[model samples]
Target: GSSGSSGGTQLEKLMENMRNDIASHPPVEGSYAPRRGEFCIAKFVDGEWYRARVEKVESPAKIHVFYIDYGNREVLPSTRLGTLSPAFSTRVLPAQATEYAFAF
Candidate 1:
């Protein structure tokens, strides 16, 4: 039971790490081991009818723009992005979720 609890704690830490990593630019989680590039998520907000990729991450709490296939849209801090996942297969992107890119 103790081992299970320990494992759960570790996983929670990892989730927290991933959340922090995904939400921040020049991520504080990665400062100790800076890498040249990063992986991010395309999200769907709870009330919205679309999913978009996170194009830019700002300090404190702001993502510059969220993009859907049609075009880029600016989102504010109050938006609740849905679950995070990577696009492993290009073919699946259109059906499963949409990917976003910087318009400019």
Candidate 2:
């Protein structure tokens, strides 16, 4: 079975595979605005909904969501986001990438 052992293994391979996992679960709108450490999805830009994690609510309109499977360092309004399924969020999914392995 796979663990974090014996080389972390493939990232992009797991990334593409994981997309189906997120989409199949499919994020939904929450009753309340997201907050720090909440998991979300960035669904506005890509025709695909990529998994996102919140850093903070920086303003009335904007919250930062760094998409771990996607391009680095993205931010947008709370307007575009809905919450990830609690089951999905609780699972805590991420695609491995770059020096962020340590820096993150």
Candidate 3:
């Protein structure tokens, strides 16, 4: 039998190096490397879309996301979701606004 108290072993050093490498590399944008707690749009195999938020970053190849409205959670492959686009502007229409006025 061996003593149960030991520190700074070779296995620990190698594991540390592997973690560093995993953190340093960046995968393709919008396709991989999902940031934790980020909003994205997930499409199911049946072609339904739902707004989702990243709950965890398991790795560069997999992510855990939660669908807010439907209360669904899944750990899916990196390609299962796409980054939410930030290109839209918000607008409000007055109730009194006429159809002719709205037409441009």
Candidate 4:
């Protein structure tokens, strides 16, 4: 029950660490009780609330995000960023973050 020494784990070992609560609680547009849940966030597209990340918050309405499972980027205003599961916001950063860095 600790998380030190940095860079973490492996496979089924991944499950126990996450299965502790794998059931995603994507704040169903839910009560709009979301903030920067913070990153590892979510936004609606094509009727599905796909996983997203916070790229910046330059403007109150400028909610920036890059995807986790795909090569894409978009802007979601607060009207769209209504629900963010703090769970997603933490840990497990997406490959895109690194890609952008290298690409940068």
Candidate 5:
């Protein structure tokens, strides 16, 4: 009885660990969540979300970090694309927020 109970407990613990690991890391890449300045390639269009290149990531601990250009505005053009074509939607995904998910 002692050996049986101990073995069962160990097996249960192992199963629990595996379940947690699986939950943390899913088999399929579901909804994609992007951080500030991180680019996500569009599924429909071949366009790539330009990284909002930050001069310095302020408060790396926080979800969203304040960003600014390195030096001048000329280096970085205000060239906007995608659903952000200023015609369809002029809004960019808020930093630290998730955007549209694309499938490979």
Candidate 6:
């Protein structure tokens, strides 16, 4: 009986911690939802930002993303991600283009 209650309390604490974390870094206004296969950027726990693609929308407030450069996947809170940069999107060549236009 006591063990069951203790386990429940632990689970509650974990949920609370996640809630607090999400609260501190709320998603940008009008940027709450991301569509699957969309390009974006995500901030990791260490504060490093990376380019990523939206693999799936895990929930209204969470998403599964593949880090484009790292070849890794993670389900992160929406607050920690952002839409792709304007300049980066602009430089991406059209799907039918044979030559790379933008210089590094």
Highest TM-score scorer: 2
Better of 4 and 6 by TM-score: 6
Give the per-residue lDDT digits (tens) of candidate 6, residues 1-104: 24554655432443344334444653473474667877766778776555566788877667887766446777887777776554433234222212212211
Q: After TM-score superposition, what is the CA distance of residue 100 in candidate 3 from its true location, in Å? A: 40
Instruction: Please write out the lDDT profile of model 2 over residues 1-104, one tens digit for every residue.
Output: 34574444344444455457656765444333767777666665665665566766786477776675544556767755666654444254455434334324
Structural similarity to truth (TM-score) of each candidate: 0.34, 0.55, 0.48, 0.45, 0.19, 0.54
Model 4 Cα lDDT, one tens digit per residue, 1-104: 55887554432343334334433543333334224424444455653454455666555566666655354667776555544444433244344333444322
Q: Name the lDDT of candidate 4.
A: 0.47
In angstroms, the error of model 5 at 72 is 66
Where model 2 places Cα greater than 4 Å from the true spot, the runs are 1-32, 86-93, 97-104
lDDT of 4 at 10: 37
Every candidate's lDDT: 0.37, 0.57, 0.50, 0.47, 0.27, 0.57
Ordered list by TM-score, greatest first: 2, 6, 3, 4, 1, 5
Clashing pairs in 4: none
Ranking by lDDT: 2, 6, 3, 4, 1, 5
Off by over 4 Å in 3: 1-32, 86-104
Candidate 3 local lDDT, 28-52, one digit each (tens): 3457456786766555556444445
Clashes of 1: 0
Task: Give the winner by lDDT.
Answer: 2
Candidate 5, superposed: residue stretches over 4 Å from native: 1-8, 29-104
TM-score for candidate 6:
0.54
- RMSD of every candidate to native, in Å, equals 11.2, 6.4, 20.7, 8.1, 17.8, 15.2
